[PDB]
Amino acid sequence: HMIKVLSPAKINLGLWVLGRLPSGYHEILTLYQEIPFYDEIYIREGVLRVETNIGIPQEENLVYKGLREFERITGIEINYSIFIQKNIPPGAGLGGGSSNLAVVLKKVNELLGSPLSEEELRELVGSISADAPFFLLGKSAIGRGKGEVLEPVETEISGKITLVIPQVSSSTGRVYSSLREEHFVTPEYAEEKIQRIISGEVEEIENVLGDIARELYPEINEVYRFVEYLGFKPFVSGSGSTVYFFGGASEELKKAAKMRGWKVVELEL
Ligand SMILES: C[C@](O)(CO)[C@H](O)COP(=O)(O)OP(=O)(O)OC[C@H]1O[C@@H](n2ccc(N)nc2=O)[C@H](O)[C@@H]1O
Ligand SMILES: Nc1ncnc2c1ncn2[C@@H]1O[C@H](COP(=O)(O)OP(=O)(O)O)[C@@H](O)[C@H]1O
Ligand SMILES: [Cl-]
């Protein structure tokens, strides 16, 4: 009895870093926005298996790690065969892996009689991925702490958004590790910025991890410069690699993308 579950992406509509935590993580503020861009996940009764169409090893898959932790916490044997069709590229700053982890573990929990509460599930996915708890909420939310302390919000943002995703995979850890004092801001500063974005002022979006990613991976900067040339203000999701803008894709951009190996995703919010 195979089922299909959709695993959506997010973008950050702005991100600010407040400082380092002794744990090695960073305290942040960000506006998360779930976007209609999905991995397709097929769940089948069978021997525990987690496969993708892009060669991610089972042992390194967040979903697999989550299911194995589920088994350990709960005592219940997981007999599900998982295949993920990965439309959302790894290292794109769209939280694809985090989404995968959250929707699979939410579904498997329900299928097995809900041995974990909303809170326990949240803590489980959260202990593996800072972005994963967002995907248990979806829609629009302010993420605080490491990103997992969530406040649902209603924004005045709608219309076309285009994602331009280069082939280069951005390492989240490497981008965060390049942060120094000059990159940090007070929460009061970030908090004012986020509220303006929520009210529709998209010009107020910024993201220091984007600044760093453009330096560490020159192709992200090329995409960024190309979007400017197209007549749009570019923005960066996560720690890169994705650049987005508020508008549609022209034939010129599609041509550039085809030639350069960029993925162009046209969305409506
Ligand atoms: C950049 C964002 O995509 C914005 O939504 C997220 O903060 C990244 O979250 P994620 O992909 O779930 O990241 P994780 O897999 O939990 O952590 C990967 C690495 O990123 C760094 N990291 C992540 C989250 C955070 N609040 N501070 C950090 O410093 C840590 O060095 C960590 O080892
Ligand atoms: N199910 C999964 N989907 C995508 N990436 C995964 C998955 N499981 C593990 N990974 C690993 O996580 C990294 C990218 O994950 P992703 O959530 O796309 O990062 P980000 O969105 O922060 O750029 C890659 O190194 C990849 O090998
Ligand atoms: Cl930005």
Residue numbers in the entry: 0 to 268
Manuscript excerpt for this entry:
4-Diphosphocytidyl-2C-methyl-d-erythritol kinase (IspE) catalyses the ATP-dependent conversion of 4-diphosphocytidyl-2C-methyl-d-erythritol (CDPME) to 4-diphosphocytidyl-2C-methyl-d-erythritol 2-phosphate with the release of ADP. This reaction occurs in the non-mevalonate pathway of isoprenoid precursor biosynthesis and because it is essential in important microbial pathogens and absent from mammals it represents a potential target for anti-infective drugs. The enzyme displays the characteristic α/β galacto-homoserine-mevalonate-phosphomevalonate kinase fold, with the catalytic centre positioned in a deep cleft between the ATP- and CDPME-binding domains. Gel filtration and analytical ultracentrifugation indicate that AaIspE is a monomer in solution.
Similarly, CDPME2P was present in the crystallization conditions for the sample used to derive complex II, but only CDPME was observed. The lack of electron density for the terminal phosphate groups of CDPME2P and AMP-PNP is either a result of disorder and/or hydrolysis. The substrate CDPME binds into a deep cavity between the N- and C-terminal domains, surrounded by residues on β1, α4, the N-terminal end of β2 and θ2 and the β5-β6 loop. His25 forms three hydrogen bonds to the pyrimidine. The cytosine position is also stabilized by hydrophobic contacts with the side chains of Tyr24 and Tyr175, the latter forming π–π stacking interactions with the cytidine. The erythritol moiety of CDPME protrudes into a cavity in which catalytic residues Lys9 and Asp130 are placed. The O2M group, where phosphate addition occurs, participates in hydrogen bonds with Lys9 NZ, Asp130 OD2 and a water molecule (not shown) that in turn associates with the main-chain amide and OG of Ser238, and β-phosphate of ADP. The placement and interactions formed by O2M are consistent with a mechanism that involves polarization of the hydroxyl group and Asp130 acting as a general base in proton abstraction to generate a nucleophile. ADP binds in a cavity formed by the N-terminal domain adjacent to the CDPME-binding site. In AaIspE the syn conformation is also observed with the adenine moiety placed in a hydrophobic cleft surrounded by aliphatic side chains of Ile53, Ile55, Leu61, Ile83 and Lys85 with contributions from Pro89 and Gly96.
